[PDB]
Amino acid sequence: XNXXX
Amino acid sequence: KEFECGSGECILRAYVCDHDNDCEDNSDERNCNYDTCGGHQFTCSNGQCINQNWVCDGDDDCQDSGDEDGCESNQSHHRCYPREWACPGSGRCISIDKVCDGVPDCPEGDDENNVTSGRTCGMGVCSVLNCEYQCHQTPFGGECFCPPGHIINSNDSRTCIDFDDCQIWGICDQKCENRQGRHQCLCEEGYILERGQHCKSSDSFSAASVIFSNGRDLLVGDLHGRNFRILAESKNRGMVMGVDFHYQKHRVFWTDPMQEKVFSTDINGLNTQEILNVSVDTPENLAVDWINNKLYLVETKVNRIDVVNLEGNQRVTLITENLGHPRGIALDPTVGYLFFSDWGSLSGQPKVERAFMDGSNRKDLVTTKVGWPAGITLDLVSKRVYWVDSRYDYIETVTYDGIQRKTVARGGSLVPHPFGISLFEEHVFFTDWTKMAVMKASKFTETNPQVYHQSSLRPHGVTVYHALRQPNATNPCGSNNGGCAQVCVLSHRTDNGGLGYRCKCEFGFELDDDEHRCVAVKNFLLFSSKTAVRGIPFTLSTQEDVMVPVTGSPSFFVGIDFDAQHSTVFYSDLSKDIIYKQKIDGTGKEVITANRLESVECLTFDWISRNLYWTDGGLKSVTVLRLADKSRRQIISNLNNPRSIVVHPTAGYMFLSDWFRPAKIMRAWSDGSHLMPIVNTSLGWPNGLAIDWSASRLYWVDAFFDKIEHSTLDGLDRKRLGHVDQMTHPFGLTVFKDNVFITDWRLGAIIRVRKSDGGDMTVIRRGISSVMHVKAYDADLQTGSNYCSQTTHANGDCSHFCFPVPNFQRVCGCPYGMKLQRDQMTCEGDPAREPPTQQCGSLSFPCNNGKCVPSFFRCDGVDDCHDNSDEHQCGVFNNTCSPSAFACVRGGQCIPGQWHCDRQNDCLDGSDEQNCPTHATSSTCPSTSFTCDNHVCIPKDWVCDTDNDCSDGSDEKNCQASGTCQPTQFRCPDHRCISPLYVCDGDKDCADGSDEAGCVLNCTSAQFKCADGSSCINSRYRCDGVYDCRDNSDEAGCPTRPPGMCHLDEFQCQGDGTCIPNTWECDGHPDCIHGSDEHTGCVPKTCSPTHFLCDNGNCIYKAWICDGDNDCRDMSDEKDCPTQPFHDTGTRCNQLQFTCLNGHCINQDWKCDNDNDCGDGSDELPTVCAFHTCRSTAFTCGNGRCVPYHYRCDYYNDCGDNSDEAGCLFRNCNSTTEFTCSNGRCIPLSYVCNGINNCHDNDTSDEKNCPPHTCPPDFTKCQTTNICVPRAFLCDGDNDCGDGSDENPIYCASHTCRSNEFQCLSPQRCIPSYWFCDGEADCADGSDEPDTCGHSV
Ligand SMILES: *[C@@H]1O[C@H](CO)[C@@H](O[C@@H]2O[C@H](CO)[C@@H](O[C@@H]3O[C@H](CO)[C@@H](O)[C@H](O)[C@@H]3O)[C@H](O)[C@H]2NC(C)=O)[C@H](O)[C@H]1NC(C)=O
Ligand SMILES: *[C@@H]1O[C@H](CO)[C@@H](O[C@@H]2O[C@H](CO)[C@@H](O)[C@H](O)[C@H]2NC(C)=O)[C@H](O)[C@H]1NC(C)=O
Ligand SMILES: *[C@@H]1O[C@H](CO)[C@@H](O[C@@H]2O[C@H](CO)[C@@H](O)[C@H](O)[C@H]2NC(C)=O)[C@H](O)[C@H]1NC(C)=O
Ligand SMILES: *[C@@H]1O[C@H](CO)[C@@H](O)[C@H](O)[C@H]1NC(C)=O
Ligand SMILES: *[C@@H]1O[C@H](CO)[C@@H](O)[C@H](O)[C@H]1NC(C)=O
Ligand SMILES: *[C@@H]1O[C@H](CO)[C@@H](O)[C@H](O)[C@H]1NC(C)=O
Ligand SMILES: *[C@@H]1O[C@H](CO)[C@@H](O)[C@H](O)[C@H]1NC(C)=O
Ligand SMILES: *[C@@H]1O[C@H](CO)[C@@H](O)[C@H](O)[C@H]1NC(C)=O
Ligand SMILES: *[C@H]1O[C@H](CO)[C@H](O)[C@H](O)[C@H]1NC(C)=O
Ligand SMILES: *[C@H]1O[C@H](CO)[C@H](O)[C@H](O)[C@H]1NC(C)=O
Ligand SMILES: *[C@H]1O[C@H](CO)[C@H](O)[C@H](O)[C@H]1NC(C)=O
């Protein structure tokens, strides 16, 4: 997933 | 040609005169240049110089084995030593005074009687040996023993030959000579010889003391511990970490990792002051250059080694490359080396490293069997380094060149966990974290270390405070700062041609080609990560930073940008939801805004208008802010998952990326209007955008197809770059010169490729943790001026912010709650449409800083507002402490609950450490877990592993060398017991690797085998595009897409040939470049009557239309909301043309601008211009007209009211050589009355035609000035003379020209008769050439 951790 | 020897032989010049005999005549070896080696070289016995890296590598380069002497850690003796006996089992040597004395004096105990061998101690065959000195009893019988300087010969025990006692370890503590008495000791100056072996400090120096950290406080005592004095006590839960001093100035320095500060103080405890508190976060250790007045500092939040002066002003980073985990540091300024330790690098190798005192010529001083090397101390008189190890648990010493490794202590019962160490004369004082005490140890060999001070906490670095610890030496930088411009950092005495120093520049500067004068930095690579924001030189040949790292205690940095005109960088912090600004040097940290920030994913800076854009991924919007005065507004509001945004100031465009399933890339005017997609086909996860300023090409990065593309700013002419190796998931992107810089989350690295094709992938950084955007700092880029920042006025005459617009225009804007007035430039209040809003809701406390915190976080003892504003004046009435915190009974102070009775006096009155339960009760941890004296419990398996698990040493007490570990624990042969979870784990945990050697790998169904069996990687990393195994066994044999075709589950675009997932086929969105994936064969989508079919095909409840949010993810459900109630000739002009009363349409930009264009004045009638308002890009006069903006401040009253020259500031012309006209125009004095007007001012005093008093005919005289404009330019619409004679109230108004001229109809211009009806149209409308006039060719 391309979500900022 | 070559050199011919005297014996008749040819030898090559390079091998002529190189200590090689060559020809037997030795012709090439009679001459001796053979100069002394430099700092980077090792000196062999014969004088040959070899590079430092060749030392102890396995090759006898010196031809004497001087560079391969004792690289092993003293595994065994070499024929033992004279008057000593050898134990067969482990190579330990003891003398006859212990052999057969009745006590087992070596680990095997073979030196006494044994029932398993029958050996007995007594006399024997030695009567036949007849030894040179004496006989004595051994278990084999009588054997030879010989005096000092007497060793037995080659396999001849009866014969003793003279021996060099100078080679024995510890024969003399400092120095030894063998010319007299078979040996003799001597001492360095300042020391005085005592007995015949020991050198002690002379009493001519004041005193000697040891300084060490108790783990909380800074202690000091004498060399025997009779009395101890607390020097400086730690405040605010501080922790003294690493200590060093400066005997000349009587100052003691110590670091603080808990307080993230570095202090210094006098030896008396006076004048305790902070040396550094910026960018220093975990200063593990410290060191002082006592002759150059420097302070070398270790940092571990951003692993680096710094140097700063004793007062803490001039700062510069020295070592950054591959520095891993720096722990220890030591230096010898007199000779000029820097020694530092490293217990793990970016490469897995741990090492003890040597370097010059300016970071040059790094060398692996000790590499084999180093484990976890810790602080380092130096023997300044014998030229040896001492380091301690926490993994293999030993104290070892090597020389300055790494040769002659000798072990002074070893074992889990001797030094279970050393941290720090220091030498004074003959004793190494070393901290140990397991016995929890500073221990005093002999520096040659020890059977058992003595306890010097037993602590209740883990102690830390130790130093010995004495003058002889800092020998005198000259200062190379003392000769007027060494000539360096900013900073002089000492180096090796042979470096810089013997000058002994190298010039440096503080942060924000770089050295010119002279290496003496600093110049302001122009370019460097700026990148962000979870832990820090860093700036790196582009040239990979060097590694050290140019800007101070930006770091905090909680830290997650994402977005960054820079302001070159102020040497300022911006950044965001998702752990604080704030946007900061900070200088390159690190000073002047300020916040920009901390209000209503929700996951700001990126930033960009409009360097000409000074506007800051950021993207709120939580608010789902983009915001602009003017830095001159805080003024913010949401310009785009209804996005789905916006990401990196980039703005083009000169072109007036901004670009933003969205990666919700219908992914796209948008473009808009800088105003935040005309939003439209430019790339919406064949996209997935478009993370990073970048702009090529040298070509106006937009570069963007995709992460779903693993591609990087580029196109013009219009989105046309789209091109892809080639395959980039090991790129699986790119986030950041930056284009600078001919390189493209990218950051991949899967790699956790910064890679560089060529900007025109796939390029030579070059890794810039590795192991950079969670990595975020990159940015190219460049001061040349931030150059230019639109009409928003043109001179002669400011900010484009707009209140608040003005936005550059494409085609060289500007549009004025104002913040939230403001509306543009009728003039379209200045803004008035608009509370009717946008009412004022609070900083926080009713359930949250607004801090003094713009942030917002929960209302029950007030006075909880923890700074949540990042301004302490929530913890201010707490404890008083109407300001009670939170229920979670603990309140001190007096003085009004609230402290966190976890600080209540934790053995630290936190409350100012000590209320937090008073009357709390001592009842450990009969409470017991499970029978599996061992119980410490602190009632903390750990498993039985953890006992006696030399690790202080209990935090009080209870699990390591009464540990003995009996070698009788528990059945579960594995036993290293002579090191320690160890847990099974460390046996065969890929890591050598024992000293000799006995726990890892001989085992095999073994893997579950969720793991994969490398082909060579070197590692057992997770199955997730199989076939991922990243080479994980060293032998590349994971990515080999992966499914290959058939040539031309695509995989089974992947649609193919017929017009392009690329592949997209079948889930994207017939979804309602054309992903293929020609829309081939939404062909007419797609089944149409249906929706239920109870739902609403959104424009993207979604079905949503019809109740939810206009409910407050776009549930469709498209504007469909919220776009259509009228639901809200109260609670003549036939021909015609075009769409964009104004219509006059008499026709002749005129373009709408000519409407109401003081130019009559309709003839009748319809385009300028007062009725027409009464309601007309200026376009947003045009300047509005005070009269109400709409002139183009480029007419503003151009010396010319084109507005009529002079409203557009009102307030213009004009540069003062040099009146000594130029002429300042009445309108403000600057013209040279030489151009005054030069022949034609140049000022064109209202005065028209420029062109008076001063010299001549008249002009001849043809070039006819003008009226009030004698300019020679011909009559052919009469009544032509412009004043050619500038003095009326062409407009001529006399001619062209009385009668039609002279007899030889004709007056045109449009313009009303008299033209020569040979122009009139000559066959060529000379009037504007051709009134001189009608069919009526006739005439012929
Ligand atoms: C390194 O060099 C410095 C400067 O030469 C040495 O410091 C100075 O050493 C002298 C002794 O040679 C000291 O003189 C003594 O001072 C005391 C106190 O006033 C006095 O009672 C004695 O009679 C004698 O005069 C001097 O004070 C001292 N300090 C300075 C700044 O001059 C230093 O000892 C040298 N260190 C080493 C390790 O060589
Ligand atoms: C994807 O982007 C293109 C532009 O590259 C859009 O095509 C434009 O569509 C509008 C109408 O919506 C036309 O007026 C323009 O002439 C089209 N091209 C230009 C020159 O912009 C296209 O509509 C976009 N598709 C989606 C699904 O948003
Ligand atoms: C809450 O209690 C505090 C402590 O008495 C009050 O703080 C004072 O507030 C006034 C007005 O802002 C300041 O002028 C004083 O300097 C503050 N401290 C002192 C010295 O009293 C605060 O006013 C109280 N608030 C309420 C609503 O009672
Ligand atoms: C024993 O010592 C003598 C000394 O000359 C030497 O010649 C001989 O080689 C040695 N033998 C062994 C086996 O060491
Ligand atoms: C650092 O120290 C200086 C001088 O005491 C002080 O002015 C500054 O506020 C300090 N900054 C921090 C973050 O403590
Ligand atoms: C580990 O070892 C055994 C053989 O010794 C093997 O059968 C088992 O499947 C392996 N299991 C794991 C945990 O990988
Ligand atoms: C103006 O001209 C004079 C004479 O050439 C020169 O000395 C002076 O520096 C100039 N000053 C400015 C402000 O241009
Ligand atoms: C200067 O401007 C005024 C209008 O403000 C005009 O009447 C006058 O004629 C101008 N001066 C000259 C020398 O033309
Ligand atoms: C030998 O050469 C080195 C440089 O290689 C230094 O100049 C050193 O000072 C020299 N030694 C002597 C004694 O002159
Ligand atoms: C209140 O919120 C609005 C947006 O809803 C604006 O950001 C406004 O500036 C805010 N007011 C204050 C005082 O911050
Ligand atoms: C006083 O203020 C604190 C602020 O966190 C809490 O609201 C608390 O409940 C208040 N009342 C008391 C009795 O402490």
Ligand SMILES: *[C@H]1O[C@H](CO)[C@H](O)[C@H](O)[C@H]1NC(C)=O
């Ligand atoms: C200690 O506590 C554990 C956990 O509750 C068990 O109750 C155990 O039986 C107790 N031990 C003793 C000796 O009472």
Ligand SMILES: *[C@H]1O[C@H](CO)[C@H](O)[C@H](O)[C@H]1NC(C)=O
């Ligand atoms: C050593 O001590 C342990 C303590 O648990 C056992 O008693 C063991 O039997 C002893 N002996 C050996 C050889 O391990």
Ligand SMILES: *[C@H]1O[C@H](CO)[C@H](O)[C@H](O)[C@H]1NC(C)=O
């Ligand atoms: C890749 O390897 C597979 C192995 O089954 C097939 O041979 C396939 O045709 C190959 N394709 C390419 C392009 O090499």
Ligand SMILES: *[C@H]1O[C@H](CO)[C@H](O)[C@H](O)[C@H]1NC(C)=O
């Ligand atoms: C649309 O109609 C089809 C049958 O033609 C199905 O009932 C389908 O489920 C309908 N759409 C939705 C969203 O229910």
Ligand SMILES: *[C@H]1O[C@H](CO)[C@H](O)[C@H](O)[C@H]1NC(C)=O
């Ligand atoms: C002038 O201002 C009005 C609002 O007062 C409108 O924005 C109008 O569109 C503007 N004029 C033009 C030509 O756009």
Ligand SMILES: [Ca+2]
């Ligand atoms: Ca030679």
Ligand SMILES: [Ca+2]
């Ligand atoms: Ca070698």
Ligand SMILES: [Ca+2]
């Ligand atoms: Ca004995």
Ligand SMILES: [Ca+2]
């Ligand atoms: Ca990917």
Ligand SMILES: [Ca+2]
């Ligand atoms: Ca709080």
Ligand SMILES: [Ca+2]
């Ligand atoms: Ca406490």
Ligand SMILES: [Ca+2]
């Ligand atoms: Ca250990």
Ligand SMILES: [Ca+2]
């Ligand atoms: Ca343990």
Ligand SMILES: [Ca+2]
């Ligand atoms: Ca292991």
Ligand SMILES: [Ca+2]
């Ligand atoms: Ca892989």
Ligand SMILES: [Ca+2]
């Ligand atoms: Ca599709």
